[PDB]
């Protein structure tokens, strides 16, 4: 074994922690929650994982660190019963993370790369969502079957391109920060068209004006005809909000300044159907027609604190991938606790600094446009990039497609190990393999379980389920590190300096409170199942 | 044993088949789907149960009919493996039926008996639903804990009042038909106020007119001030749909005639947010303000065929309660197949004739008002009653509160039997009992599983889950009656005249297609779990 801390522990953690939510949902989270509550979300979600890494360090500093995987360390150092629970929750988390990574790639493809590559179209006036869901499901079943065939044939090729997907993430992050520094002295041009407080969808009309001049004549624009249903300048069919108010352009990226950061500082939660609005604009109050409602940027889902925590939390998962090469290391009891804790610290500093950067550079109206309707269907992250917005689009697409392949390779190997371990006999039949040792019936079960996550067809609906499984895995790791100290069981002497049982107890309680914060109902279901297995024993 | 067919098999089936959906959701289903598609829903949902009763007759005509319950017949006549599946699916169905019966009683209490007995109020303008859900959950946890204490103490008293809850159902059905016959020559007076096609909520304003006369002076009414935001007769702040249209009263119950039945004959499916409208009225087309949207009757959920099937199907469940007294009967191989099939035929004739009666007597605008907003917060069923609408309100409340108690008494006894039967050792610890033999740890598990159904807090969200469990139970009964004939296993010789294996095969395929019709996603989950247990064996 010859593999150091950097390329053995640190870089796989840093590759498995960054992902889809930094490029699709972080600006939305900043603009919805405010800078202060977004920093609070990042702080709370990075203390479950830091305390869980302190417990995993106490795992790795005990004994020999047996070769192969993070399942075998836990199972040989904690007894089989905690090992089975940690392994099964981590397996279900990895299989739904594959589905979330596929849904992210299809959102990027259908909204930014090729919008004409769309099968189902929003017929009628309203319900653009059912066309969107049925459009996500078809491409989800296509990409999932293609990638399971790739994993069924070409594992050697998936292991080959693993550095390129990390290079794409790092180049696309450095482009964000390079453009954010340039926005201090030279911000880019993305004008946002508004009407009173209300922001509107710029993709539908031509010019952001109420009237124009053609051939020495004042003629109503296309924007007049959507609100007034007549090309005449003196009709009374207009809605009274359009008549009393005026149409105004603003800079979408006003540049890095303290005045922009002061406006983005507090929460602006909306319900489903509300309109994204500024705060410092004059707006005469008036009723508005129901028919002019598609001419605005509308909140897609109802938001709160507990909604945003469950969507953010799978950004911080990825600790457990620092022990998959635990046999290949030179000093596994030293390279694991340093590598995972430094990876959590660096990725958490990237999230804090990016929350402050997006809160200081981008205006909160553009931030709250999930899918970027206020600026001509562009990434809100991509408009801040330095060379072009296409670098972030292409790089985030290839990185999410790589992160899906890595989950579809990592989860059947894990189910293979629990099957051959024979703690649960009900999972006996998934120990079959080929002559290479590659799993067959486990790959089918991961493809069918990740299919049930793809048929939910939303990035915002699958991510609380991921939070729910990774929080159970991290809860049982902290239970099994606190109980073995309080019971004084033999062969449990962790040689880690910064370990204490109260830290693992605090980590257990925090990763249990986040389980209720993310979704209280399914946490209350899992509490019943856990309280029933305890009565079984 | 001295107990005949009528009081032993027929009356418990007829008591357990009628219930909450005949009084709360049948008029809504007729008005939404049309008379023809409502008869098609009743026909399809009564052919799964008739074929399942033909299979249960082949169970009862084999062998001895061992004493006690419907679980012991199936388990001794089909092998333990099918018996465990049928028993566990029927247990989960009974525990969620308790939750649906509690949610029905709380809907009746909070909307018709005591609307001031409401904790959470709809603050703001919109979202009257979250106040409603949080208002259902609190009273659900109160009624569930009270009834589990009653079952924990007073089983002898719950068995005593069992005839009174059947008397309430039969009196409240006879009042419906007595009022429906009276509506031929003397219909009751329930005027419905409308504005163009759109129907409005009469509970908010006083008089159904656009202007009135007070003290020899034409003054705008209260209904003017909601749409125009000014008491002056000559303002231009009115929405243009209110100006171009006129306000009209219609009879809500126009009486039994062929012309009313001809209008109610075809489907009118709406999406969530649409307005209930007539078809034969003049209405000038115009836009409408967003602020006047609470002044209408709005569709609560999006409806289709597959939505209404899953809501209707737990009306027809209740076959399996014809064998709970299988030891007390004089001739159990004769009293069961006659009693259950005659009970299914009589209850299905009641549903067909009531669908035709509500389609012929009540106007389809009043039928599509779930919660009865178009007529002064009254039951749509209750307005057709002969003495008073209060008889149906009180009788349906007491019958649903009795049907919840009967499920909370029947499900822990069933889990007790599967625990003592020892096919699944994981359920070993639920075989404990008191000195009376009454279950203790099973009653706790039924109270915690029915709590997870109450925390969904909708009658329309729990009923597809009930359909999902009773259809799996009825599928395994037909599998176990077809496979034992095709495999020619010993000790399976059913002495029933009208049994054939193709009928049970057709019943299996129909109760599998209804599983996809009711909700395709959770059926696709259960298909995975069933295909995994088969690979285990
Ligand atoms: C050890 C061995 C390994 C394999 C195995 O065991 C043995 O492992 C286990 C693990 C199992 C899996 C465990 C967990 C599971 C998750 C479970 O999902 C629960 C709820 C979610 C799914 O929602 C469903 O999604 C479908 C599809 O949309 C819906 O079906 C609909 O489909 C069509 C649409 O065209 C239509 O007919 C209807 O819409 C409907 O039929 C279901 O109805 C729906 O329940 C998460 O969804 C939740 O939905 C909420 C919406 O109300 C949402 O709330 C918010 O919604 C929006 C946000 O988008 C906002 O407006 C508001 O803020 C809220 O209203 C929630 O966010 C969201 O959580 C499914 C099963 C599965 C995968 C288990 C499968 C078996 C399993 C793998 C076993 C194996 C054997
Ligand atoms: C043998 C031994 C015995 C005991 C045991 O095993 C051992 O038995 C098993 C059996 C287990 C149970 C099996 C099945 C279960 C059902 C499962 O529910 C699945 C989905 C449904 C629940 O929905 C959830 O409801 C909660 C509460 O609302 C939501 O949480 C929300 O709460 C708040 C609201 O304030 C807010 O934060 C968010 O809204 C959210 O957090 C969940 O999100 C939600 O998933 C059914 O709900 C489905 O919801 C759809 C809405 O999207 C709806 O679609 C339609 O919705 C409306 C209609 O109303 C229409 O507009 C459209 O037509 C559609 O959108 C669907 O109709 C609806 O199906 C929960 C677990 C449970 C009970 C298992 C528990 C364990 C169990 C008993 C074991 C034991 C151990
Ligand atoms: C919308 O913007 C226009 C600017 O074109 C505002 O116009 C007012 O115009 C009159 C006469 O042209 C001036 O005397 C006022 O000083 C203007 N008001 C200003 C500059 O605030 C108009 O008031 C705006 N509408 C609003 C703010 O509701
Ligand atoms: C944007 O402008 C509106 C008025 O044009 C602001 O005022 C609110 O308007 C709604 C009407 O839907 C009223 O119900 C509220 O009471 C109004 N709030 C007031 C008067 O304080 C609205 O607040 C503005 N949005 C912002 C500042 O984010
Ligand atoms: C609403 O109802 C009124 C009835 O009061 C209709 O009034 C019309 O009134 C003029 C003059 O009073 C008559 O000459 C017309 O014959 C009436 N039209 C009829 C009876 O159809 C009014 O047209 C109605 N509005 C509609 C149908 O949009
Ligand atoms: C009730 O009246 C409206 C017009 O007052 C009817 O017409 C439809 O109106 C909508 C506007 O929301 C249009 O999009 C449709 O194209 C109209 N349909 C037509 C003209 O056929 C509406 O159909 C009526 N409702 C009924 C008869 O149930
Ligand atoms: Cl991620
Ligand atoms: Cl992880
Ligand atoms: Cl019922
Ligand atoms: Cl039944
Ligand atoms: K991650
Ligand atoms: K029933």
From Swiss-Prot, chains A, B:
Shown chain mapped onto the complete sequence: 116 to 652 of 1085
Residues that bind chloride 1: 318-320, 474
Organism superkingdom: Eukaryota
Similarity-based family: Belongs to the SLC12A transporter family. K/Cl co-transporter subfamily.
Gene, per the UniProt record: SLC12A4
UniProt-annotated binding residues for K(+): 16-17, 101, 314, 317
Subunit text: Homodimer; adopts a domain-swap conformation at the scissor helices connecting the transmembrane domain and C-terminal domain. Heterodimer with other K-Cl cotransporters.
List of glycosylated residues: 130, 197, 216, 232, 246
Bridged cysteine pairs (disulfide): 193-208, 228-238
Extracellular side: 27-34, 111-133, 183-304, 359-389
TM regions (residue ranges): 5-26, 35-57, 82-110, 134-156, 157-182, 305-325, 336-358, 390-416, 440-460, 461-483, 498-520, 521-536
Residues engaged in binding chloride 2: 474
Species: Homo sapiens
Tissues of expression: Ubiquitous. Levels are much higher in erythrocytes from patients with Hb SC and Hb SS compared to normal AA erythrocytes. This may contribute to red blood cell dehydration and to the manifestation of sickle cell disease by increasing the intracellular concentration of HbS.
Ranges of the Cytoplasmic topological domain: 58-81, 326-335, 417-439, 484-497
Name of the featured protein: Solute carrier family 12 member 4
PTM statement from Swiss-Prot or TrEMBL: Phosphorylated, phosphorylation may regulate transporter activity.
Task of the protein: Mediates electroneutral potassium-chloride cotransport when activated by cell swelling. May contribute to cell volume homeostasis in single cells. May be involved in the regulation of basolateral Cl(-) exit in NaCl absorbing epithelia.
Outcome reported for the amino acid change (mutating residue 25 to Q): Decrease in Cl(-) efflux
Cellular localisation: Cell membrane
């Amino acid at each position: 074994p010859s593999m150091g801390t950097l390329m053995g522990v640190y870089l796989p953690c840093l590759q498995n922690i960054f992902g889809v939510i930094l490029f699709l949902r972080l600006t939305w989270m900043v603009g919805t929650a405010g800078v202060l509550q977004a920093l609070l979300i990042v702080l709370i979600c990075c203390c479950c994982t830091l305390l869980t890494a302190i417990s995993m360090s106490a795992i790795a500093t005990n004994g020999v660190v047996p070769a192969g995987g993070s399942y075998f360390m836990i199972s040989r150092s904690l007894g089989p019963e905690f090992g089975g629970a940690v392994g099964l929750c981590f397996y279900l988390g990895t299989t739904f993370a594959a589905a979330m990574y596929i849904l992210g790639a299809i959102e990027i493809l259908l909204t930014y790369i090729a919008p004409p590559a769309a099968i189902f179209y929003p017929s009628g006036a309203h319900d653009t969502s059912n066309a969107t869901l049925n459009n996500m499901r078809v491409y989800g079943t296509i990409f999932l079957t293609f990638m399971t065939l790739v994993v069924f044939v070409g594992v050697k090729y998936v292991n080959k391109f693993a550095s390129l997907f990390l290079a794409c993430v790092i180049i696309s992050i450095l482009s964000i920060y390079a453009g954010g520094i340039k926005s201090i002295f030279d911000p880019p041009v993305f004008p946002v068209c508004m009407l009173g407080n209300r922001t509107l969808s710029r993709d539908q009309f031509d010019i952001c004006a109420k009237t124009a001049v053609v051939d020495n004549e004042t003629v109503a624009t296309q924007l007049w005809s959507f609100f007034c249903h007549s090309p005449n300048l003196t009709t009374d069919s207009c809605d009274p909000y359009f008549m009393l108010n005026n149409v105004t352009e603003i800079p979408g990226i006003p540049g890095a300044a303290a005045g922009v950061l002061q406006e983005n500082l507090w929460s602006a939660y909306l319900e489903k159907g509300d309109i994204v609005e500024k705060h410092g604009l004059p707006s005469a109050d008036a009723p508005s027609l129901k028919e002019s409602l598609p001419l605005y940027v509308v909140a897609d889902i109802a938001t709160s604190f507990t909604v945003l925590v469950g969507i953010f939390f799978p950004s911080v998962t990825g600790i457990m991938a620092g022990s998959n090469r635990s046999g290949d290391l030179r000093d596994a009891q030293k390279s694991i606790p340093v590598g995972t804790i430094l990876a959590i610290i660096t990725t958490s500093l990237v999230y804090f600094s990016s929350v402050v950067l997006f809160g200081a550079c981008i205006e909160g109206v553009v931030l709250r446009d999930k899918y970027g309707d206020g600026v001509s269907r562009n990434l809100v992250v991509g408009t801040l990039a330095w060379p072009s917005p296409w670098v972030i689009v292409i790089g985030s697409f290839f990185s999410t497609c790589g992160a899906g392949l890595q989950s579809l390779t990592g989860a059947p190997r894990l189910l293979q190990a629990i099957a051959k371990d024979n703690i649960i006999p009900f999972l006996r039949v998934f120990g079959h393999g080929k002559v290479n040792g590659e799993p067959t019936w486990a790959l089918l079960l991961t493809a069918l379980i990740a299919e049930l996550g793809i048929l939910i067809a939303s990035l915002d609906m699958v991510a609380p389920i991921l939070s729910m499984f990774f929080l159970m895995c991290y809860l049982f790791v902290n239970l099994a590190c606190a109980v073995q100290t309080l019971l004084r069981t033999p062969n449990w002497r962790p040689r880690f300096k910064y370990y204490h049982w109260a830290l693992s107890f605090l980590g257990m309680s925090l990763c249990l409170a986040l389980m209720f914060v993310s979704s209280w109902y399914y946490a209350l279901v899992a509490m019943l199942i856990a309280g029933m297995i305890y009565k079984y024993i």
